[PDB]
Structures are given as structure tokens and as C-alpha cells.
DNA sequence: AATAGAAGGAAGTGGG
DNA sequence: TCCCACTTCCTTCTA
């Protein structure tokens, strides 16, 4: 099963949910969620994982925060904005 | 207050 | 056994 950071990177590459997520500075790996359309993206994550309950953005962001230590994804001090690591981007 | 973003401890679930 | 990689629940805190 796909890892969350890869799910997000793949969405950004394909462009299939451009109203819910977008690059801010793609060279730096910074990206941002839509305030109004993030929940539809969270729902898609939960359905792709086959989880028991409906996925929410809050729960998806709780998972994102766990990457802070290992570094795959870090929180940017901007509303709804995060940053992929160079290692994640290279793959 | 209402709305909403952000944090994180802790317990539960998956698939090795 | 026991870590992976989250998921779920709840409370707190900040803007
Ligand atoms: N578990 C703890 N003890 C804990 C410790 C620290 C915490 O801090 C939370 C926090 C940190 C930084 C920034 C923010 C809020 O940011 C916002 C940005 C933009 C908007 C907007 N324009 N609508 C609204 C809010 N909230 C929370 C709980």
C-alpha cells in the first residue's frame, strides 16, 4: 500500500486534484492545500487505503506531522503549507 | 462567539 | 514478538 507522502506527490505530478492541492515552489518542494477543497482529497486518501472510517483532513494532517522527525514532509509556517524533502523529490 | 488551523499524547489497526 | 506506517480519538492551543 502506498505511503501518504507518495500519494500526495503523485497527485501533484498528475494534476488530478488541482483545486485541492498545488505547488507553491515546486523547485523547493513546497505545496499547499485548498482551505475549501482539502476534504475531498482527504476522502480519496482514506478510500485508497481501504480504512474503516471516513478519512478527514485533520486525521491526514495528524499523519503528516509524524514525518517531521524523519523529514519526508515538514510543516511550513504558512497556512496549509508543507515541504517535501530533497530525497522524496528525487524519487 | 464562530470558524478554522495547528499541535501532540495515547491507544488501536495493518502487514509483515 | 515487535516494529511499520499510519488511524482514531481526544484535548489543548493559536489566529
Ligand atoms: N498540544 C499542545 N499543547 C499544543 C501546542 C501548540 C499548539 O499550537 C497550535 C498552533 C500553532 C501555530 C499556529 C496555529 C494556528 O495557525 C493558524 C493560521 C492561520 C489561520 C487562519 N488564517 N485562518 C488560523 C490559525 N496553531 C497547539 C496545541
Domain that holds residue A44: 1-91
The answer to whether A14 CB is within 7 Å of strand B is no
Terminal CA-CA length for chain A: 17
Interval between CA A76 and ligand 1 midpoint (Å): 12
Distance between CA A72 and CA A76 in Å, rounded? 13
Place of cell 522527525: A69
A10-48: string of b/e by CB count within 10 Å (b at 16+)?
ebbeeeebeebbeeeeeeebbbbbbeeebbebbebbbee
Measured CA to CA, the distance from residue A71 to residue A15 in angstroms comes to 24
**Range A35-42, long-range pairs (CB < 8 A, 24+ positions):** A35/A79, A35/A80, A38/A80, A41/A11, A41/A17
- Phi, psi of A54, rounded to the nearest 5 degrees: -65, 130
Number of structural domains found in chain A: 1
Q: Which three cell numbers stand for residue A68?
A: 517531521
How far does the centroid of ligand 1 lie from the alpha carbon of residue A79, in Å?
10
Whether A76 contacts A30, CB under 8 Å: yes
Amino acid at each position: 500500500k502506498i505511503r501518504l507522502y507518495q500519494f500526495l506527490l503523485d497527485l501533484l505530478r498528475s494534476g488530478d486534484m488541482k483545486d485541492s492541492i498545488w505547488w507553491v515552489d515546486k523547485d523547493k518542494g513546497t505545496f499547499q492545500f485548498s482551505s475549501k477543497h482539502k476534504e475531498a482529497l482527504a476522502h480519496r486518501w482514506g478510500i485508497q487505503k481501504g480504512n474503516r472510517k471516513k478519512m478527514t483532513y485533520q486525521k491526514m494532517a495528524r499523519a503528516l506531522r509524524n514525518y517531521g522527525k524523519t523529514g519526508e514532509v515538514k510543516k511550513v509556517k504558512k497556512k496549509l503549507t508543507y515541504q517535501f524533502s530533497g530525497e522524496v523529490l528525487g524519487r
